[PDB]
Amino acid sequence: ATCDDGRTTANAACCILFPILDDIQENLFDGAQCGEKVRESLRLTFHDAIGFSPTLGGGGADGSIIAFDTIETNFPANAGIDEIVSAQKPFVAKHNISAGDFIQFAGAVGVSNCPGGVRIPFFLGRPDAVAASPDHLVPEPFDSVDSILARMGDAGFSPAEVVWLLASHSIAAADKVDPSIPGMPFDSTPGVFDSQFFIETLLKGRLFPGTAANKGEAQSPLQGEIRLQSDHLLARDPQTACEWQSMVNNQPKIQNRFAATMSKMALLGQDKTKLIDCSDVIPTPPALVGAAHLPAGFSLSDVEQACAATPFPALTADPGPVTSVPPVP
Ligand code: HEM
Ligand SMILES: [Ca+2]
Ligand SMILES: [Ca+2]
């Protein structure tokens, strides 16, 4: 099919997505930047979709977190999610797209803004949300590895898939984990979708980045960087450690596994065969910037070898003394 200006798309239905693309790039993503709203939008795709259980209920990737926002944004596990829900609501109302479609579309478009990012498949046609998600379906950073893997598994994700989805934390920061110091990222490159998150979580912890250890927080190897306890444990757990370590300096795998598993997550509670493939609408992301490295002042001795099958790859450290991670703008 073709759109008004002759651009090819596999289905004519996808043409309605282009004005939505332009509007969000300009008015949600601050001129197609990989910034705060991109990160919050990626996070929202998860908080919307993970509200899904074959036995416990929830319609999954159905836009319920927007359509029933007063209920869902008040779940303890959804702390801080109100701001991005509130920012996205006018776009949903203004455009001719369901809330479930908009959330996943905004996430895929956002990721395409990030250097090293990957194009996530996108399907159009999710119905309006039917009911609010049940509470207690969103994993929390203080949950045990077994609890987290059981909840994600109930939703349909294997431990390896949990690792692949956690590539999202390569472009991520926290406001609620430690309320005193908002905007500390989970890796040293929160604006670059790269392997630094998997490297840095495997380093021996050194400090608590604020003035307090908070619930759900582990020791961080870097000042200005925050480490979730869930990430700390998943990096090292036998169920996940070899998968975690394999992401290190493996950009093609990070991209490929993230795209595939995000697509699967965006379809929770949905039937892809009743939807329309509009993947070709998502822009090509900019290429990776920077390279895999240990932070400056670190050596391979700082790695906590958790994978038994294979040793950590022999990365080199950035030059100079150990430095802090600047807060995200
Ligand atoms: C599997 C268990 C997970 C846990 C326990 C977890 C936990 C967290 C926490 C505590 C935050 C910080 C919230 C705050 O204080 O502001 C966060 C941020 C974030 N999460 Fe995860 N997460 C998980 C999985 C995922 C998945 C599957 C995605 C996929 C899209 C994702 C995407 C993000 C993003 C992009 C941010 C950054 C938000 C921002 O920069 O504003 N997370 N996560
Ligand atoms: Ca939902
Ligand atoms: Ca990064």
Tab-separated table of C-alpha atoms and ligand atoms in Angstrom:
chain	number	residue	atom	x	y	z
A	1	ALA	CA	0.000	0.000	0.000
A	2	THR	CA	1.104	3.623	-0.154
A	3	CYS	CA	0.456	6.679	1.939
A	4	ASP	CA	-0.517	10.119	0.670
A	5	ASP	CA	3.048	11.041	-0.329
A	6	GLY	CA	3.836	7.715	-1.963
A	7	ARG	CA	5.605	6.081	0.985
A	8	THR	CA	5.181	2.316	1.020
A	9	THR	CA	3.608	0.558	3.990
A	10	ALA	CA	2.589	-3.114	4.108
A	11	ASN	CA	-0.996	-2.194	5.088
A	12	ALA	CA	-2.923	0.965	4.184
A	13	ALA	CA	-4.271	1.067	7.751
A	14	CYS	CA	-0.797	2.035	8.993
A	15	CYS	CA	-0.944	5.436	7.294
A	16	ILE	CA	-2.857	6.937	10.195
A	17	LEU	CA	0.231	6.388	12.386
A	18	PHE	CA	2.441	8.978	10.657
A	19	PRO	CA	0.726	12.138	11.947
A	20	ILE	CA	0.762	10.528	15.397
A	21	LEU	CA	4.456	9.820	14.975
A	22	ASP	CA	5.158	13.453	14.046
A	23	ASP	CA	3.095	14.843	16.915
A	24	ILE	CA	4.700	12.709	19.645
A	25	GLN	CA	8.223	13.248	18.296
A	26	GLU	CA	7.627	16.982	18.587
A	27	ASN	CA	5.333	17.289	21.582
A	28	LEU	CA	6.086	14.287	23.777
A	29	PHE	CA	9.716	13.458	22.959
A	30	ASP	CA	11.159	16.986	22.909
A	31	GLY	CA	12.150	16.856	19.224
A	32	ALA	CA	12.747	13.108	18.828
A	33	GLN	CA	15.286	12.984	21.648
A	34	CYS	CA	16.111	9.954	23.789
A	35	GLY	CA	15.166	11.795	26.972
A	36	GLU	CA	12.964	11.558	30.054
A	37	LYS	CA	9.659	11.086	28.237
A	38	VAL	CA	11.099	8.307	26.047
A	39	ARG	CA	12.287	6.476	29.163
A	40	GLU	CA	8.978	6.916	30.957
A	41	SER	CA	7.086	5.767	27.867
A	42	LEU	CA	9.184	2.601	27.604
A	43	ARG	CA	8.525	1.963	31.276
A	44	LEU	CA	4.775	2.409	30.679
A	45	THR	CA	4.673	-0.339	28.035
A	46	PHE	CA	5.691	-2.755	30.783
A	47	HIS	CA	3.397	-1.447	33.507
A	48	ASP	CA	0.459	-1.621	31.087
A	49	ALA	CA	1.277	-5.032	29.631
A	50	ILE	CA	2.396	-6.960	32.698
A	51	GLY	CA	-1.102	-6.617	34.181
A	52	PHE	CA	-1.849	-10.055	32.731
A	53	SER	CA	-2.307	-13.529	34.206
A	54	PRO	CA	-4.092	-16.553	32.804
A	55	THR	CA	-5.583	-17.263	36.260
A	56	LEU	CA	-5.270	-13.966	38.174
A	57	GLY	CA	-6.830	-11.771	35.466
A	58	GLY	CA	-5.861	-8.564	33.679
A	59	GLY	CA	-6.145	-7.766	29.981
A	60	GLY	CA	-2.424	-7.168	29.455
A	61	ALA	CA	-1.368	-4.660	26.794
A	62	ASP	CA	-4.805	-3.077	26.668
A	63	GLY	CA	-4.252	0.535	27.693
A	64	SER	CA	-5.943	-0.067	31.069
A	65	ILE	CA	-3.289	1.949	32.941
A	66	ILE	CA	-4.551	5.030	31.092
A	67	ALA	CA	-8.271	4.135	30.866
A	68	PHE	CA	-8.428	3.207	34.537
A	69	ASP	CA	-5.642	5.530	35.737
A	70	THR	CA	-7.120	6.497	39.124
A	71	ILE	CA	-7.158	2.781	40.034
A	72	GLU	CA	-3.897	1.549	38.497
A	73	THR	CA	-1.579	4.549	39.061
A	74	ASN	CA	-2.442	4.106	42.751
A	75	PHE	CA	-1.002	0.592	43.022
A	76	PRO	CA	2.214	0.748	45.129
A	77	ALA	CA	4.146	-0.901	42.269
A	78	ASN	CA	3.037	1.899	39.932
A	79	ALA	CA	4.579	4.696	42.002
A	80	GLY	CA	5.553	7.631	39.803
A	81	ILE	CA	3.804	6.272	36.723
A	82	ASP	CA	1.094	8.972	37.009
A	83	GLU	CA	3.198	11.644	35.288
A	84	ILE	CA	3.679	9.770	31.976
A	85	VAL	CA	0.041	8.546	31.997
A	86	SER	CA	-0.999	12.182	32.432
A	87	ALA	CA	1.312	13.318	29.606
A	88	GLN	CA	0.015	10.657	27.179
A	89	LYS	CA	-3.726	11.094	27.805
A	90	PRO	CA	-4.131	14.171	25.570
A	91	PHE	CA	-2.466	12.385	22.664
A	92	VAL	CA	-4.833	9.419	22.991
A	93	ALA	CA	-7.847	11.730	23.095
A	94	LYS	CA	-6.560	13.790	20.160
A	95	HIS	CA	-5.659	10.893	17.928
A	96	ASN	CA	-7.834	8.121	16.558
A	97	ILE	CA	-5.868	5.356	18.265
A	98	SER	CA	-6.732	3.109	21.243
A	99	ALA	CA	-4.868	3.691	24.522
A	100	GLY	CA	-3.388	0.193	24.286
A	101	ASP	CA	-2.077	0.899	20.805
A	102	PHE	CA	-0.785	4.348	21.754
A	103	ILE	CA	1.231	3.118	24.736
A	104	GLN	CA	3.085	0.504	22.678
A	105	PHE	CA	3.477	2.838	19.696
A	106	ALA	CA	4.925	5.620	21.865
A	107	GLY	CA	7.364	3.122	23.404
A	108	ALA	CA	8.576	1.748	20.067
A	109	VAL	CA	8.924	5.258	18.633
A	110	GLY	CA	10.758	6.435	21.744
A	111	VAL	CA	13.274	3.582	21.591
A	112	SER	CA	13.938	4.403	17.923
A	113	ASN	CA	15.256	7.759	19.155
A	114	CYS	CA	18.044	6.187	21.196
A	115	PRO	CA	21.559	5.566	19.816
A	116	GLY	CA	22.051	1.792	19.704
A	117	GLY	CA	18.254	1.489	19.798
A	118	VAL	CA	16.321	-1.128	17.839
A	119	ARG	CA	13.101	-1.072	15.824
A	120	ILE	CA	10.407	-2.899	17.829
A	121	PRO	CA	7.639	-4.567	15.804
A	122	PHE	CA	4.317	-2.761	16.095
A	123	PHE	CA	0.797	-4.033	15.563
A	124	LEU	CA	-2.261	-1.798	15.254
A	125	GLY	CA	-5.783	-2.551	16.447
A	126	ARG	CA	-5.959	-3.244	20.201
A	127	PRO	CA	-9.533	-2.664	21.434
A	128	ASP	CA	-10.275	-0.120	24.205
A	129	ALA	CA	-9.535	-1.417	27.707
A	130	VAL	CA	-12.343	-3.488	29.284
A	131	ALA	CA	-11.380	-3.472	32.974
A	132	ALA	CA	-8.693	-2.186	35.337
A	133	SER	CA	-5.786	-4.493	35.977
A	134	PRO	CA	-5.823	-6.376	39.251
A	135	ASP	CA	-3.254	-5.126	41.778
A	136	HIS	CA	-0.165	-7.255	42.633
A	137	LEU	CA	0.842	-8.072	39.051
A	138	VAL	CA	3.792	-5.674	38.658
A	139	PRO	CA	7.161	-6.990	39.942
A	140	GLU	CA	8.892	-4.728	42.493
A	141	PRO	CA	12.662	-4.168	42.889
A	142	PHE	CA	12.619	-5.649	46.396
A	143	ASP	CA	10.953	-8.893	45.287
A	144	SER	CA	13.082	-12.053	45.384
A	145	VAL	CA	14.415	-13.487	42.112
A	146	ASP	CA	12.050	-16.440	42.472
A	147	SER	CA	9.071	-14.131	43.029
A	148	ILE	CA	10.015	-11.979	40.040
A	149	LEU	CA	10.670	-14.952	37.734
A	150	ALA	CA	7.416	-16.645	38.826
A	151	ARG	CA	5.388	-13.495	38.134
A	152	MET	CA	7.064	-12.891	34.767
A	153	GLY	CA	6.727	-16.600	33.948
A	154	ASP	CA	3.016	-16.534	34.808
A	155	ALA	CA	2.771	-13.687	32.262
A	156	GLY	CA	4.578	-15.872	29.728
A	157	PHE	CA	8.256	-14.869	29.969
A	158	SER	CA	11.194	-17.162	30.635
A	159	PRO	CA	14.091	-16.072	32.835
A	160	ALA	CA	16.183	-15.482	29.698
A	161	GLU	CA	13.367	-13.273	28.371
A	162	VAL	CA	13.349	-11.298	31.629
A	163	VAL	CA	17.035	-10.631	31.075
A	164	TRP	CA	16.408	-9.536	27.481
A	165	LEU	CA	13.611	-7.153	28.512
A	166	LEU	CA	15.890	-5.690	31.195
A	167	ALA	CA	17.989	-4.209	28.388
A	168	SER	CA	15.383	-1.466	28.906
A	169	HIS	CA	17.372	-0.509	32.026
A	170	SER	CA	20.201	0.600	29.755
A	171	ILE	CA	18.098	3.722	29.180
A	172	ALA	CA	16.595	4.150	32.612
A	173	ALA	CA	16.609	6.274	35.782
A	174	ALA	CA	14.705	6.285	39.074
A	175	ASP	CA	12.648	8.988	40.821
A	176	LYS	CA	10.830	6.949	43.486
A	177	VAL	CA	13.429	4.404	44.662
A	178	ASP	CA	15.265	7.240	46.387
A	179	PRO	CA	12.911	10.277	46.449
A	180	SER	CA	15.654	12.598	47.734
A	181	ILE	CA	17.803	12.227	44.615
A	182	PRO	CA	15.537	11.794	41.578
A	183	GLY	CA	16.964	10.932	38.161
A	184	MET	CA	19.893	8.660	38.924
A	185	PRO	CA	20.290	6.159	36.061
A	186	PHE	CA	20.784	2.376	36.163
A	187	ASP	CA	23.833	2.569	33.898
A	188	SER	CA	26.408	5.217	33.034
A	189	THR	CA	24.828	5.769	29.599
A	190	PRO	CA	21.086	6.399	30.170
A	191	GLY	CA	20.871	8.051	26.741
A	192	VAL	CA	22.505	5.133	24.940
A	193	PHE	CA	20.876	1.720	24.473
A	194	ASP	CA	23.988	-0.387	25.070
A	195	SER	CA	25.529	-3.111	27.233
A	196	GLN	CA	26.774	-0.825	30.022
A	197	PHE	CA	23.795	-1.844	32.165
A	198	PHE	CA	24.784	-5.501	32.017
A	199	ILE	CA	28.471	-4.735	32.646
A	200	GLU	CA	27.923	-2.313	35.518
A	201	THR	CA	25.412	-4.460	37.443
A	202	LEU	CA	28.029	-7.241	37.479
A	203	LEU	CA	30.633	-5.073	39.175
A	204	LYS	CA	31.268	-5.415	42.910
A	205	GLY	CA	29.159	-2.802	44.755
A	206	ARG	CA	30.951	0.113	46.403
A	207	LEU	CA	28.533	2.664	47.872
A	208	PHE	CA	24.957	3.721	48.402
A	209	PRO	CA	24.560	6.674	46.025
A	210	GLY	CA	22.378	8.843	48.246
A	211	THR	CA	22.116	9.464	51.952
A	212	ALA	CA	20.218	6.205	52.480
A	213	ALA	CA	19.859	2.615	51.390
A	214	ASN	CA	16.254	2.438	50.242
A	215	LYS	CA	13.851	-0.451	49.899
A	216	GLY	CA	14.617	-2.298	46.672
A	217	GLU	CA	18.114	-0.844	46.367
A	218	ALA	CA	21.500	-2.575	46.315
A	219	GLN	CA	25.005	-1.158	46.552
A	220	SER	CA	26.062	0.673	43.390
A	221	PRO	CA	29.558	0.542	41.887
A	222	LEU	CA	29.357	4.212	40.918
A	223	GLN	CA	28.379	7.456	42.597
A	224	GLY	CA	25.339	8.954	40.869
A	225	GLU	CA	24.295	5.513	39.657
A	226	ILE	CA	21.623	3.522	41.424
A	227	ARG	CA	21.405	-0.260	41.474
A	228	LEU	CA	18.110	-2.040	41.993
A	229	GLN	CA	18.227	-5.089	44.235
A	230	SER	CA	16.304	-7.106	41.633
A	231	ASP	CA	18.903	-6.290	38.940
A	232	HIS	CA	21.731	-7.057	41.336
A	233	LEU	CA	20.260	-10.478	42.108
A	234	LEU	CA	19.212	-11.330	38.522
A	235	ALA	CA	22.719	-10.588	37.304
A	236	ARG	CA	24.016	-13.221	39.725
A	237	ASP	CA	21.246	-15.826	40.037
A	238	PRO	CA	21.999	-19.223	38.405
A	239	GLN	CA	18.707	-19.030	36.507
A	240	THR	CA	19.813	-15.844	34.772
A	241	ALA	CA	23.545	-15.161	35.240
A	242	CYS	CA	24.860	-16.729	32.040
A	243	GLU	CA	22.194	-15.030	29.943
A	244	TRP	CA	22.935	-11.737	31.729
A	245	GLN	CA	26.666	-12.013	31.077
A	246	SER	CA	26.153	-12.941	27.417
A	247	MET	CA	24.623	-9.487	26.799
A	248	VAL	CA	27.986	-7.884	27.653
A	249	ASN	CA	29.608	-6.323	24.543
A	250	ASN	CA	26.926	-8.025	22.456
A	251	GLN	CA	25.019	-5.216	20.781
A	252	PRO	CA	23.367	-7.369	18.080
A	253	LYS	CA	21.935	-9.723	20.688
A	254	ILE	CA	20.712	-6.927	22.944
A	255	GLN	CA	18.871	-5.351	20.002
A	256	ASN	CA	17.538	-8.573	18.524
A	257	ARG	CA	16.379	-10.087	21.818
A	258	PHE	CA	14.901	-6.804	23.061
A	259	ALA	CA	12.890	-6.303	19.863
A	260	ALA	CA	11.525	-9.864	19.854
A	261	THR	CA	10.591	-9.899	23.518
A	262	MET	CA	9.134	-6.377	23.456
A	263	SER	CA	6.923	-7.433	20.563
A	264	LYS	CA	5.727	-10.400	22.623
A	265	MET	CA	5.120	-8.170	25.646
A	266	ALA	CA	3.188	-5.611	23.542
A	267	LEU	CA	0.837	-8.439	22.560
A	268	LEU	CA	-0.003	-9.702	26.071
A	269	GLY	CA	-3.771	-10.229	26.229
A	270	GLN	CA	-3.952	-9.798	22.446
A	271	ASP	CA	-4.136	-12.017	19.347
A	272	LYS	CA	-1.606	-10.826	16.737
A	273	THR	CA	-3.632	-12.460	13.928
A	274	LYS	CA	-6.503	-10.048	14.620
A	275	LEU	CA	-4.136	-7.093	14.408
A	276	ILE	CA	-2.378	-5.286	11.571
A	277	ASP	CA	1.408	-5.334	11.216
A	278	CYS	CA	2.590	-1.726	11.051
A	279	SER	CA	6.212	-2.393	12.017
A	280	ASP	CA	7.504	-0.546	8.950
A	281	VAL	CA	6.278	2.750	10.426
A	282	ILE	CA	8.880	2.773	13.212
A	283	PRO	CA	11.953	4.878	12.283
A	284	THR	CA	15.449	3.391	12.016
A	285	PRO	CA	17.289	4.228	15.275
A	286	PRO	CA	20.628	6.056	15.236
A	287	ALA	CA	23.694	3.808	15.388
A	288	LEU	CA	25.425	2.962	18.653
A	289	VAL	CA	27.738	5.532	20.223
A	290	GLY	CA	30.596	4.516	22.500
A	291	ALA	CA	31.882	1.004	23.116
A	292	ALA	CA	31.623	-1.625	25.851
A	293	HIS	CA	33.973	-0.742	28.738
A	294	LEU	CA	34.584	-1.102	32.451
A	295	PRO	CA	34.110	2.311	34.116
A	296	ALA	CA	37.281	4.348	34.635
A	297	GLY	CA	39.183	3.181	37.722
A	298	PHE	CA	37.928	-0.385	37.461
A	299	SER	CA	39.625	-3.626	36.460
A	300	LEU	CA	38.436	-7.171	35.751
A	301	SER	CA	39.030	-7.997	39.434
A	302	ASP	CA	35.945	-5.838	40.155
A	303	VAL	CA	33.695	-8.286	38.316
A	304	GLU	CA	31.678	-10.760	40.332
A	305	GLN	CA	31.890	-13.892	38.200
A	306	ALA	CA	28.407	-15.395	38.454
A	307	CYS	CA	28.265	-17.392	35.233
A	308	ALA	CA	29.794	-20.837	35.796
A	309	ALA	CA	29.942	-21.933	32.149
A	310	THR	CA	31.946	-18.987	30.806
A	311	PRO	CA	34.194	-16.281	32.281
A	312	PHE	CA	33.390	-12.569	31.971
A	313	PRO	CA	34.756	-11.110	28.718
A	314	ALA	CA	38.064	-9.256	28.945
A	315	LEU	CA	36.859	-5.656	28.536
A	316	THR	CA	39.215	-2.732	29.003
A	317	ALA	CA	38.518	0.176	31.317
A	318	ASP	CA	37.988	3.779	30.308
A	319	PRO	CA	41.114	5.851	31.114
A	320	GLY	CA	41.493	7.974	34.263
A	321	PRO	CA	40.324	7.962	37.905
A	322	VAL	CA	36.922	6.627	38.981
A	323	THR	CA	34.235	9.221	38.179
A	324	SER	CA	30.601	9.712	39.174
A	325	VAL	CA	27.562	9.362	36.921
A	326	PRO	CA	25.828	12.713	36.258
A	327	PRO	CA	22.073	12.772	36.931
A	328	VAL	CA	19.902	12.648	33.827
A	329	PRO	CA	18.832	16.227	32.784
B	1	HEM	C1	11.279	-7.428	35.801
B	1	HEM	C2	11.156	-6.664	36.894
B	1	HEM	C3	11.394	-5.127	36.886
B	1	HEM	C4	11.544	-4.400	37.998
B	1	HEM	C5	11.541	-4.955	39.437
B	1	HEM	C6	11.737	-3.015	37.620
B	1	HEM	C7	11.946	-1.961	38.481
B	1	HEM	C8	12.107	-0.635	38.111
B	1	HEM	C9	12.188	0.509	39.001
B	1	HEM	C10	12.109	0.472	40.542
B	1	HEM	C11	12.348	1.605	38.254
B	1	HEM	C12	12.481	3.054	38.775
B	1	HEM	C13	11.092	3.637	39.081
B	1	HEM	C14	11.322	4.946	39.784
B	1	HEM	O1	11.647	4.927	41.006
B	1	HEM	O2	11.200	6.009	39.116
B	1	HEM	C15	12.379	1.204	36.860
B	1	HEM	C16	12.536	2.052	35.782
B	1	HEM	C17	12.399	1.736	34.444
B	1	HEM	N1	11.959	0.517	33.927
B	1	HEM	FE1	12.083	-1.247	35.031
B	1	HEM	N2	11.690	-2.940	36.238
B	1	HEM	C18	11.470	-4.219	35.754
B	1	HEM	C19	11.343	-4.538	34.421
B	1	HEM	C20	11.245	-3.660	33.358
B	1	HEM	C21	10.852	-4.021	32.012
B	1	HEM	C22	10.454	-5.445	31.566
B	1	HEM	C23	10.876	-2.922	31.244
B	1	HEM	C24	10.516	-2.933	29.730
B	1	HEM	C25	10.147	-1.838	29.057
B	1	HEM	C26	11.313	-1.810	32.083
B	1	HEM	C27	11.520	-0.497	31.716
B	1	HEM	C28	11.941	0.540	32.525
B	1	HEM	C29	12.392	1.845	32.073
B	1	HEM	C30	12.572	2.378	30.629
B	1	HEM	C31	12.697	2.634	33.349
B	1	HEM	C32	13.219	4.086	33.431
B	1	HEM	C33	12.091	5.060	33.729
B	1	HEM	C34	12.622	6.471	33.645
B	1	HEM	O3	13.822	6.656	33.310
B	1	HEM	O4	11.851	7.421	33.921
B	1	HEM	N3	11.525	-2.303	33.364
B	1	HEM	N4	12.223	-0.171	36.812
B	2	CA	CA	-2.972	-3.197	31.149
B	3	CA	CA	22.977	2.625	28.580
